Every structure is written in C-alpha cells, then in structure tokens.
Design an enzyme around this catalytic site. Structure first.
Site, PDB file in Angstrom:
ATOM      1  N   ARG A   1       0.955  -1.130  -0.060  1.00 41.86           N
ATOM      2  CA  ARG A   1       0.049   0.158   0.150  1.00 41.86           C
ATOM      3  C   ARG A   1       0.924   1.393   0.184  1.00 41.86           C
ATOM      4  NH1 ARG A   1      -1.757   4.016   4.189  1.00 41.86           N
ATOM      5  NH2 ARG A   1      -1.886   2.541   5.721  1.00 41.86           N
TER       6      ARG A   1
ATOM      7  N   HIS B   1      -2.301  11.190   1.511  1.00 44.58           N
ATOM      8  CA  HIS B   1      -1.431  11.074   2.744  1.00 44.58           C
ATOM      9  C   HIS B   1      -0.832  12.311   3.239  1.00 44.58           C
ATOM     10  CE1 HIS B   1       0.453   7.550   5.356  1.00 44.58           C
ATOM     11  NE2 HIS B   1       0.403   8.855   6.038  1.00 44.58           N
TER      12      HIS B   1
ATOM     13  N   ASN C   1      -5.739   8.373   3.585  1.00 46.93           N
ATOM     14  CA  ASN C   1      -5.291   7.883   4.995  1.00 46.93           C
ATOM     15  C   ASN C   1      -5.708   9.013   6.187  1.00 46.93           C
ATOM     16  OD1 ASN C   1      -3.255   5.894   6.250  1.00 46.93           O
ATOM     17  ND2 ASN C   1      -2.737   7.959   7.035  1.00 46.93           N
ATOM     18  N   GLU C   2      -6.300   8.396   6.848  1.00 43.67           N
ATOM     19  CA  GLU C   2      -6.682   9.236   8.366  1.00 43.67           C
ATOM     20  C   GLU C   2      -7.362  10.459   8.273  1.00 43.67           C
ATOM     21  OE1 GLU C   2      -3.157   8.390  10.530  1.00 43.67           O
ATOM     22  OE2 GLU C   2      -3.509   6.417  10.757  1.00 43.67           O
TER      23      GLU C   2
ATOM     24  N   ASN D   1      -6.641   1.346  10.506  1.00 43.50           N
ATOM     25  CA  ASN D   1      -5.281   1.763  10.998  1.00 43.50           C
ATOM     26  C   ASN D   1      -5.151   1.434  12.315  1.00 43.50           C
ATOM     27  OD1 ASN D   1      -4.771   2.224   8.408  1.00 43.50           O
ATOM     28  ND2 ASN D   1      -4.217   4.456   8.548  1.00 43.50           N
TER      29      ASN D   1
ATOM     30  N   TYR E   1      -3.278   0.643  16.201  1.00 45.50           N
ATOM     31  CA  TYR E   1      -1.586   0.580  16.885  1.00 45.50           C
ATOM     32  C   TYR E   1      -1.965   0.618  18.591  1.00 45.50           C
ATOM     33  CZ  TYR E   1       0.566   2.558  12.663  1.00 45.50           C
ATOM     34  OH  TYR E   1       1.102   2.972  11.673  1.00 45.50           O
TER      35      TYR E   1
ATOM     36  N   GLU F   1      -2.963  -0.741   8.791  1.00 46.40           N
ATOM     37  CA  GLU F   1      -1.609  -0.359   9.323  1.00 46.40           C
ATOM     38  C   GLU F   1      -1.545  -0.682  10.699  1.00 46.40           C
ATOM     39  OE1 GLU F   1      -0.343   3.884   9.585  1.00 46.40           O
ATOM     40  OE2 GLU F   1      -1.046   4.325   7.730  1.00 46.40           O
TER      41      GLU F   1
ATOM     42  N   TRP G   1       3.005  -1.221   8.944  1.00 48.17           N
ATOM     43  CA  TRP G   1       3.642   0.225   8.983  1.00 48.17           C
ATOM     44  C   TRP G   1       5.128  -0.118   9.686  1.00 48.17           C
ATOM     45  CZ3 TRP G   1       2.397   4.212   6.206  1.00 48.17           C
ATOM     46  CH2 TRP G   1       3.326   5.464   6.331  1.00 48.17           C
TER      47      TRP G   1
ATOM     48  N   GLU H   1       9.375  10.422   9.787  1.00 43.22           N
ATOM     49  CA  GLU H   1       8.178  10.341  10.701  1.00 43.22           C
ATOM     50  C   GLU H   1       7.533  11.762  11.044  1.00 43.22           C
ATOM     51  OE1 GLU H   1       6.402   7.683  11.266  1.00 43.22           O
ATOM     52  OE2 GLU H   1       5.201   8.565  12.928  1.00 43.22           O
ATOM     53  N   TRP H   2       6.964  12.309   9.910  1.00 38.93           N
ATOM     54  CA  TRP H   2       6.292  13.654  10.116  1.00 38.93           C
ATOM     55  C   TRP H   2       7.184  14.612  11.338  1.00 38.93           C
ATOM     56  CZ3 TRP H   2       4.164  14.172   6.003  1.00 38.93           C
ATOM     57  CH2 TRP H   2       3.651  13.240   5.202  1.00 38.93           C
TER      58      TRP H   2
ATOM     59  N   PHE I   1      10.120   3.015  12.343  1.00 40.48           N
ATOM     60  CA  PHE I   1       9.159   2.081  12.213  1.00 40.48           C
ATOM     61  C   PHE I   1       9.139   1.106  11.569  1.00 40.48           C
ATOM     62  CE2 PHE I   1       6.430   5.559  14.293  1.00 40.48           C
ATOM     63  CZ  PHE I   1       5.475   4.942  14.965  1.00 40.48           C
TER      64      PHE I   1
HETATM   65  O1  LIG Z   1       3.343   6.960  13.317  1.00 44.41           O
HETATM   66  C1  LIG Z   1       3.276   5.880  12.477  1.00 44.41           C
HETATM   67  C2  LIG Z   1       2.531   5.929  11.350  1.00 44.41           C
HETATM   68  C3  LIG Z   1       2.577   7.091  10.215  1.00 44.41           C
HETATM   69  O2  LIG Z   1       4.072   7.216   9.791  1.00 44.41           O
HETATM   70  C4  LIG Z   1       1.812   6.985   9.050  1.00 44.41           C
HETATM   71  O3  LIG Z   1       1.989   7.962   8.067  1.00 44.41           O
HETATM   72  C5  LIG Z   1       0.346   7.105   9.568  1.00 44.41           C
HETATM   73  O4  LIG Z   1      -0.622   6.449   8.734  1.00 44.41           O
HETATM   74  C6  LIG Z   1       0.202   6.832  10.895  1.00 44.41           C
HETATM   75  N1  LIG Z   1      -1.058   6.543  11.630  1.00 44.41           N
HETATM   76  C7  LIG Z   1      -0.893   5.928  12.761  1.00 44.41           C
HETATM   77  C8  LIG Z   1       0.610   5.876  12.774  1.00 44.41           C
HETATM   78  N2  LIG Z   1       1.014   6.110  11.709  1.00 44.41           N
END
Ligand SMILES: OC[C@@H]1[C@@H](O)[C@H](O)[C@@H](O)c2[nH]cc[n+]21
Length: 483
Positions: free
Chosen positions: A94, A138, A183-184, A321, A323, A394, A441, A448-449, A457
């Site tokens: 993806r 994204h 995305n999100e 997504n 986590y 993700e 992911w 990482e933004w 990651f």
């Molecule tokens: O933080 C790790 C990743 C980002 O790098 C991704 O761009 C984003 O889709 C996201 N949402 C939640 C976690 N993450």
C-alpha cells in the site's frame, strides 16, 4: 557492519502458531508507506510544493531541521524495495500517490514526469507479483490549494479532489484494483486544524492562526464530501470496467472503559464516536454520530439530502489503522464553552489501572503496546457496522532513531509486537470478523512527520548516511511466518 549484526535471533523462528493457513483463503499480507515519507524528490521531477514543504520551512519544526527532500529515496531505489517485499513473502504494497507530484498546482496542468514515476513503480510491482493498493491522499495537500482558499476549509476542495481521483482512476486503474481515497482524515482534520501539530499548523493559539472550535469540523466535513465525490467517479465511470474496489483508511485507537460504571462505559463510546464514528457513521449510515451533533451543535456542518445519499455506502471496504489503546474515564461535569475538537470529547484518558500500565510504551509518545486492543477494535467495527469488509491497513511500532545498524536490526520487541497483535487479529477473524488483509507499517524506517528521523518504524533498517537497507529480525520473522 560489526559482527553482532549477523547474530541469528531465535525469536525469528517462533511464529506463535501463525501461518497463512491460520487465515482465510486469499488473505492479503503487505506493508504500507506514503509518498512524502519514502519517495524523496520533494522539490524535483516536476513536483509542486505541498503544505508540508512550507510547514517544514519554519525553524524547529522537524528535529535537527531534517527534511524529506531525500528521505529513503524510494523514487530511485523502488526496485530494491519491491524486491525486499517479495523476498520477505509479502503479497501487497500500500503506497500513496502524491497529489502535487501529479498536479503541481492541485488543479489543471498534469506533471507527466510524476505520472511516469507511478507508472514505473506500479509496473514493477506487477512484474514482481506484488499487489498495488493505491492511497490518493496522505497528508500532502498541494500548497497552491491551501493558498487559494485554505484547502480543506473550503467547499471548493471537493471537486478539486474528485478530479484528481478521476485522473488517477483513468491513468492507473488498468492495474491498480485497490484504492483508498484518504489516509486518516481524522488526523488530517485534528492535527492539521485542532492543535496545529501537522501541516498547515492551524489552531486557536497557533502562529498560522485558526479556530479549534470550528475548523476541524469544517475540514472533516469537506474530507467526507471529497471522499464521496471521488467514489462516485469511481463507481460511475471506472468500477464496472476496471473491476476494482475503493475504501478509506481510518485510524482507530481502542478506548476501553476504565471501570464498569455507566459513566466510564459511556465515555469510551463517546470517544469512539469522535474518533471513528465521525467518519464511519456518515459512510455507513449517511449521518453523524448522535453525541457529536448534540455536543458540537451549530459548529458541525450538516449534510444535504443529496450529500447524505452520496456519502452513504461510499466504500467497498474499510481500512482500519490500529496501533494502541487507552482506558477511558468520565471526567466529571463538562464546560460548556467550546474550546477544541479534542475538548469536545469530554473524556479522561488513563494509561494504567491498579498500578499496572495498560502496556509498555514504544518510542512514540502515543504508542502503548496493548495487543488485546486490536481484537476489541475489529470486533467493535464488526458489531457496530454490520460486519463490513475490513482491511487491517496499518499496524507496527517504533524504535528510537538514534541507534546503530548493529543494534537496530535486532528488534525483538517488534517481533513480539507483531506476533501478539497478529494473534489477536486472528482471534477476531475466527470469531467472524470479515478481515481480508493485513498491512504492517512500514517496510523501511522513514520520515516520521513531526518526529523527523528520531523514530524508526520499519522492519528494514535504513542507514541515513548511505541509504543502504538492512532487514531487521522482524522482517525475517515475517519471511518465516509467511511460508
Ligand atoms: O506513526 C506511524 C504512522 C505514520 O508514519 C503514518 O504516516 C500514519 O498513517 C500513521 N497513523 C498512525 C501511525 N502512523
């Protein structure tokens, strides 16, 4: 590299009883990334600037004033990357298309050089047997559109997005059969416009200006209309001929009630409403969550009848997504005065119960390792939304950025993370959840933004000095589990 790099980690070979045969026939395993986090060539190959290019320019925004002008340079080293994907056993990738790489100004002039890149990329994946899953957005709004009318804050964005979607379906849809619009969008709206943490950095107190009581709701609303408008193009013009599918990728943190009281239980449902419901209730039911309408009132836009009908059933599947999880408490009595979208939830977060933390914390401040959370979240989506087709789109965790190759590759904490989360995913599937795929992911450590390169990651380590890749133990754990 130093000898310890090549120590063989026994955890690689403990699949915890998982294999392809523990999952539905045809179940898809892949990795996920995004255009800005891996491509590089931010300012080259025709690409017009996005809101992140501008955002990054403010000093102190990214740690060490790092940039994604090169990042891991997937633009040039995509063949290597896809090869790793194939060699590790993955079925799918993806990725995202960069809007401003195709339309440098967001609308009008096509950048043929950008189109050519994505054609090369997709053709190569097809050559190697990797299924393309294309995400259209994204976090990377073309800067021009933000300048013209403030991007997501204007109803003008809807047809601008739909046209870009249309072009991509026309151009790439002969081989891409799996689309996501966004995305999100919840992060696009909240991090962009509620706390200004992400581009374009708008919020109540922010340098850029903004209004946390109104702007995230405006943004979210336009993101939903844009999604629906794009899907309408897909369904009316392309779908019956290209025979593909289209969904959206929605983040979902699991919110577990802190106690069994009616108050805490209602708090957790209230959080789900504002986190997921915000987007999934319009899409499945053609309306907003009741709690949101009652709390947010005049500050939330309303859908016309036409809009409601366009939005309802505008997905063939939903990407979740996922986590992490938190306990949720009733926070007492509520003010009253609009302050922010986040404040509008009227909840208290808790990260431990009876002295026991909900889970260990990964590198990122928000990432708590709570494998049972993936089971509850997927089951909730199954029970709340009529068992829609789901993709777990993700999932992963991060190591700190400042570690050597030798240390970076032995990520047995990540092995545990996946073994445990994938195991809890399997349970929810065994219990009836219509999950058709899973994506880690991410393949590579990447940009990482706001954390820049201080967060890793990937399941493949990347030396940022040389751009050489080094599969981590977790990559090999996948390779073993997937055969
Ligand atoms: O933080 C790790 C990743 C980002 O790098 C991704 O761009 C984003 O889709 C996201 N949402 C939640 C976690 N993450």
């Amino acid at each position: 590299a130093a000898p310890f790099t090549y120590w063989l980690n026994p955890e690689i070979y403990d699949a915890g009883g998982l294999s392809r045969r523990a999952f539905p026939e045809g179940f898809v395993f892949g990795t996920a990334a995004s255009a800005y986090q891996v491509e590089g060539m931010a300012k080259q190959g025709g690409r017009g600037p996005s809101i992140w290019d501008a955002f990054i320019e403010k000093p102190g925004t990214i740690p060490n004033n790092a940039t994604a002008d090169v990042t891991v340079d997937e633009y040039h080293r995509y063949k290597e990357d896809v090869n790793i994907m194939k060699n590790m056993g993955f079925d799918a990738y993806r990725f995202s298309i960069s809007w401003s790489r195709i339309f440098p100004n967001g609308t009008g002039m096509v950048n043929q050089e950008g189109v050519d890149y994505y054609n090369r990329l997709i053709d190569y994946m097809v050559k190697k047997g990797i299924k393309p899953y294309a995400n259209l957005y994204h976090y990377d709004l073309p800067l021009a559109l933000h300048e013209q009318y403030l991007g997501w804050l204007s109803p003008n964005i809807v047809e601008a997005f739909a046209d870009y979607a249309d072009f991509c379906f026309q151009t790439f849809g002969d081989r891409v059969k799996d689309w996501f619009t966004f995305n999100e969008p919840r992060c696009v709206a909240a991090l962009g416009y509620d706390n200004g943490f992400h581009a374009p950095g708008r919020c109540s107190g922010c340098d850029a200006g903004g209004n946390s009581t109104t702007e995230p709701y405006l943004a979210a609303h336009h993101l939903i209309l844009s999604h629906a408008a794009a899907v309408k193009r897909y369904r009316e013009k392309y779908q019956l001929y290209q025979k593909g599918r289209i969904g959206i990728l929605l983040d979902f943190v699991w919110y577990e009630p802190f106690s069994d009281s009616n108050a805490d239980r209602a708090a957790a449902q209230r959080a789900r409403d504002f986190h997921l419901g915000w987007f999934l209730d319009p899409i499945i039911h053609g309306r907003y969550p009741y709690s949101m309408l009652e709390i947010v009132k005049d500050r939330m836009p309303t859908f016309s009848d036409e809009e409601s009908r366009m939005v309802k059933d505008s997905i063939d599947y939903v990407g979740i997504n996922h986590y992490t999880s938190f306990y949720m408490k009733d926070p007492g009595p509520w003010n009253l005065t609009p302050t922010s979208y986040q404040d509008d939830w009227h909840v208290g977060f808790a990260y431990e119960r009876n002295g026991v933390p909900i889970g260990a914390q990964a590198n990122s401040y928000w990432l708590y390792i709570v494998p049972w959370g993936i089971n509850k979240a997927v089951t909730y989506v199954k029970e709340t939304y009529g068992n829609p087709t789901m993709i777990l789109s993700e999932n992963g965790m991060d190591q700190p950025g400042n570690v050597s190759i030798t240390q970076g590759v032995h990520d047995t904490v990540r092995i545990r993370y996946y073994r445990n989360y994938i195991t809890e995913l399997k349970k929810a599937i065994d219990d009836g959840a219509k999950v058709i795929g899973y994506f880690a992911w991410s393949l590579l450590d990447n940009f990482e933004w706001r954390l820049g390169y201080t967060s890793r990651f990937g399941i493949v380590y990347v030396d940022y000095k040389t751009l050489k890749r080094y599969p981590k133990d977790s990559a090999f754990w996948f390779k073993n589990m997937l055969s």
